[PDB]
Design a protein around this motif. Structure first.
Motif, PDB file in Angstrom:
ATOM      1  N   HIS A   1       7.358   5.363 -11.504  1.00 42.13           N
ATOM      2  CA  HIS A   1       7.690   4.810 -10.217  1.00 42.13           C
ATOM      3  C   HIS A   1       9.117   4.365 -10.465  1.00 42.13           C
ATOM      4  O   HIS A   1       9.334   3.458 -11.274  1.00 42.13           O
ATOM      5  CB  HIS A   1       6.820   3.593  -9.844  1.00 42.13           C
ATOM      6  CG  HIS A   1       7.072   3.122  -8.413  1.00 42.13           C
ATOM      7  ND1 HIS A   1       6.386   3.469  -7.327  1.00 42.13           N
ATOM      8  CD2 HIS A   1       8.075   2.270  -8.019  1.00 42.13           C
ATOM      9  CE1 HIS A   1       6.938   2.852  -6.310  1.00 42.13           C
ATOM     10  NE2 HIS A   1       7.949   2.138  -6.728  1.00 42.13           N
TER      11      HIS A   1
ATOM     12  N   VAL B   1      -3.632   3.718  -2.950  1.00 40.70           N
ATOM     13  CA  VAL B   1      -3.340   3.103  -4.223  1.00 40.70           C
ATOM     14  C   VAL B   1      -3.636   4.202  -5.235  1.00 40.70           C
ATOM     15  O   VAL B   1      -4.248   5.210  -4.857  1.00 40.70           O
ATOM     16  CB  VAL B   1      -4.248   1.890  -4.486  1.00 40.70           C
ATOM     17  CG1 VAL B   1      -3.935   0.841  -3.472  1.00 40.70           C
ATOM     18  CG2 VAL B   1      -5.729   2.287  -4.424  1.00 40.70           C
TER      19      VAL B   1
ATOM     20  N   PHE C   1      -3.406  -8.885  -2.155  1.00 37.56           N
ATOM     21  CA  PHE C   1      -2.991  -7.567  -1.747  1.00 37.56           C
ATOM     22  C   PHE C   1      -4.254  -6.988  -1.148  1.00 37.56           C
ATOM     23  O   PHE C   1      -5.346  -7.198  -1.664  1.00 37.56           O
ATOM     24  CB  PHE C   1      -2.501  -6.819  -3.012  1.00 37.56           C
ATOM     25  CG  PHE C   1      -2.152  -5.368  -2.734  1.00 37.56           C
ATOM     26  CD1 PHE C   1      -0.945  -5.049  -2.158  1.00 37.56           C
ATOM     27  CD2 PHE C   1      -3.090  -4.395  -2.998  1.00 37.56           C
ATOM     28  CE1 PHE C   1      -0.649  -3.745  -1.822  1.00 37.56           C
ATOM     29  CE2 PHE C   1      -2.804  -3.093  -2.662  1.00 37.56           C
ATOM     30  CZ  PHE C   1      -1.589  -2.758  -2.072  1.00 37.56           C
TER      31      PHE C   1
HETATM   32  C1  LIG Z   1       4.436   0.550  -8.251  1.00 33.25           C
HETATM   33  C2  LIG Z   1       4.235  -0.695  -7.336  1.00 33.25           C
HETATM   34  C3  LIG Z   1       3.957  -1.998  -8.073  1.00 33.25           C
HETATM   35  C4  LIG Z   1       4.916  -2.125  -9.214  1.00 33.25           C
HETATM   36  C5  LIG Z   1       4.357  -3.152  -7.202  1.00 33.25           C
HETATM   37  C6  LIG Z   1       2.528  -2.123  -8.589  1.00 33.25           C
HETATM   38  O1  LIG Z   1       2.211  -3.072  -9.308  1.00 33.25           O
HETATM   39  C7  LIG Z   1       1.448  -1.072  -8.380  1.00 33.25           C
HETATM   40  O2  LIG Z   1       1.432  -0.151  -9.197  1.00 33.25           O
HETATM   41  N1  LIG Z   1       0.482  -1.108  -7.442  1.00 33.25           N
HETATM   42  C8  LIG Z   1       0.487  -1.986  -6.267  1.00 33.25           C
HETATM   43  C9  LIG Z   1      -0.836  -2.734  -6.319  1.00 33.25           C
HETATM   44  C10 LIG Z   1      -2.011  -1.769  -6.203  1.00 33.25           C
HETATM   45  C11 LIG Z   1      -1.891  -0.840  -7.399  1.00 33.25           C
HETATM   46  C12 LIG Z   1      -0.567  -0.085  -7.431  1.00 33.25           C
HETATM   47  C13 LIG Z   1      -0.560   0.995  -6.355  1.00 33.25           C
HETATM   48  O3  LIG Z   1      -1.570   1.651  -6.132  1.00 33.25           O
HETATM   49  O4  LIG Z   1       0.609   1.123  -5.740  1.00 33.25           O
HETATM   50  C14 LIG Z   1       0.766   1.947  -4.548  1.00 33.25           C
HETATM   51  C15 LIG Z   1       1.365   3.305  -4.877  1.00 33.25           C
HETATM   52  C16 LIG Z   1       0.723   4.464  -4.125  1.00 33.25           C
HETATM   53  C17 LIG Z   1       0.545   5.798  -4.808  1.00 33.25           C
HETATM   54  C18 LIG Z   1      -0.660   6.238  -5.102  1.00 33.25           C
HETATM   55  C19 LIG Z   1      -0.807   7.320  -5.841  1.00 33.25           C
HETATM   56  C20 LIG Z   1       0.251   7.971  -6.285  1.00 33.25           C
HETATM   57  C21 LIG Z   1       1.465   7.549  -5.984  1.00 33.25           C
HETATM   58  C22 LIG Z   1       1.606   6.466  -5.242  1.00 33.25           C
HETATM   59  C23 LIG Z   1       1.677   1.234  -3.578  1.00 33.25           C
HETATM   60  C24 LIG Z   1       1.044   0.140  -2.747  1.00 33.25           C
HETATM   61  C25 LIG Z   1       2.028  -0.173  -1.662  1.00 33.25           C
HETATM   62  C26 LIG Z   1       3.359  -0.624  -2.247  1.00 33.25           C
HETATM   63  C27 LIG Z   1       3.990   0.424  -3.140  1.00 33.25           C
HETATM   64  C28 LIG Z   1       2.978   0.781  -4.225  1.00 33.25           C
END
Ligand SMILES: CCC(C)(C)C(=O)C(=O)N1CCCC[C@H]1C(=O)O[C@H](CCc1ccccc1)C1CCCCC1
Length: 107
Positions: free
Chosen positions: A87, A55, A46
């Motif tokens: 989420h 993120v 990723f």
């Molecule tokens: C919830 C997605 C999931 C289950 C796949 C996951 O494991 C996750 O939690 N991730 C994706 C991997 C990086 C860490 C985190 C994230 O920052 O997601 C960001 C969310 C962005 C955000 C930041 C701050 C506040 C709200 C939202 C995304 C990366 C792109 C894909 C969707 C999740």
């Protein structure tokens, strides 16, 4: 906040700077061990840019403390992750999340 516990050391010299793309492998779990996602299952790291606000805060703060090659467990409190919202369908409200993250490369 975010707690960083090392699984494997990195080089201890090359730390990500704002504007750099971190290439990571991760497994995200809830506190009970329940895996909710893993790029290792996809076999595709990723990528995200540090500082771009794309993120959760616990990743911005936690991955910036890691050096290239380091594998670490990031325990992130809800307010550094999805807080009260969670989420939709995957992370409940007020969930502490645990990520196993390996900082592979910086582009
Ligand atoms: C919830 C997605 C999931 C289950 C796949 C996951 O494991 C996750 O939690 N991730 C994706 C991997 C990086 C860490 C985190 C994230 O920052 O997601 C960001 C969310 C962005 C955000 C930041 C701050 C506040 C709200 C939202 C995304 C990366 C792109 C894909 C969707 C999740």
């Amino acid at each position: 906040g975010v707690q960083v516990e090392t699984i494997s050391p990195g080089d201890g010299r090359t730390f990500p700077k704002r504007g750099q793309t971190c290439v990571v492998h991760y497994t995200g779990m809830l506190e009970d061990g329940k895996k909710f996602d893993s790029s290792r299952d996809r076999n595709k790291p990723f990528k995200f840019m540090l500082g771009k606000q794309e993120v959760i805060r616990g990743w911005e703060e936690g991955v910036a403390q890691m050096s290239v090659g380091q594998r670490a467990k990031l325990t992130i409190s809800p307010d550094y992750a999805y807080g009260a919202t969670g989420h939709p369908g995957i992370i409940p409200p007020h969930a502490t999340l645990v990520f196993d993250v390996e900082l592979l490369k910086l582009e």
